[PDB]
């Protein structure tokens, strides 16, 4: 909280083991269906 999004002000979490993508884009019966992401990369709670 309170740091600007400049290169160098961003910390990488080295403890993260899960990198899977949630399927927000799918096809159902030939139509493209967009689902809102409930979960981030690795299952992180958005």
């Amino acid at each position: 909280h309170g740091l600007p999004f400049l290169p160098g002000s961003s910390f990488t979490d080295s403890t993260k083991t899960a990198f899977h993508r949630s399927q927000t884009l799918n096809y159902r019966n030939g139509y493209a269906v967009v689902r809102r992401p409930t979960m981030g990369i690795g299952g992180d709670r958005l």
Binding site: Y27, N29, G30, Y31
Partner: protein, 118 residues
Amino acid sequence: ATNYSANQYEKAYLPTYLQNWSPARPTKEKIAAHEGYTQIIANDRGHLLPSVPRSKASPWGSFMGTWQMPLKIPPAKVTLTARTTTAADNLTKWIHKNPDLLNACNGLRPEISGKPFD
């Protein structure tokens, strides 16, 4: 039957878009118009009339089985570029001498694109 075209909505009914990863039946993009009264080409109980020109093809549809399929089936893709003329000629003759494979219902729809090096 004939496939047709939902004019706005042909993209959901594209054959690869319905999970059918093989060769498929093409569709009619443009519908031709006609007017008047249509002649009854066939008499009662489904006989074709005598003087109506019947097609040369078989009545039962040409499905090529396994023991009916030709030995040494030609490839589906054959681009002739970066080839010698005699080798490309042998490939085209291989494609040519099997007219029964290329004409079936479940037949091989090949590709001959390009010109070999002379």
